[PDB]
Amino acid sequence: DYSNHVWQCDHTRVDVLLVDQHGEILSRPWLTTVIDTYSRCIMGINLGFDAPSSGVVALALRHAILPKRYGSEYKLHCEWGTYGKPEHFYTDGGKDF
DNA sequence: GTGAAGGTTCTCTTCAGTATTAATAAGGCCACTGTTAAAACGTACTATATAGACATCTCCACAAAAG
Ligand SMILES: [Mg+2]
């Protein structure tokens, strides 16, 4: 019925091969998204090599629930003015969830 | 004494006695009981002070399903 009423979360394998800072191949990361079902903002993400795990879920949840701050190395013109807790959380059946 | 031997009386004794204060006692053998300390000595209803065979809960490690 309103914003934050149901957040939704899932993970997927990003389709970019990453590299170490020394330049050698690192297998693709996983991306986790937390999404407002009303508003349809993306509320927060976690991007990393760690497989789908409750610590990864918790890491996306932290970013989503908390206010956002980014420095000038992020050349943003907008601002990611979204925060606050969900009232419900809607997921698939993964063992992390 | 000029010395020795011998003569003589002297009374009455109805008066004196009878009372306490009394010392622990002053008996010794025998045998035979029956108390009287008090010493020696079997064993009970207890009050504890352990020592250690067991039972228990807890923490950590392995096979089945979903994305
Ligand atoms: Mg999923």
A11 strand B contact, CB < 7 Å:
yes
Closest nucleotide (CA of A52 to C1')? B67
End-to-end CA distance of chain A: 24
Q: Experimental method for this entry?
A: cryo-EM
Cβ–Cβ under 8 Å, residues A63 and A47: no
A77 strand B contact, CB < 7 Å:
no
A87 strand B contact, CB < 7 Å:
no
Cα R_g (chain A), whole angstroms: 15
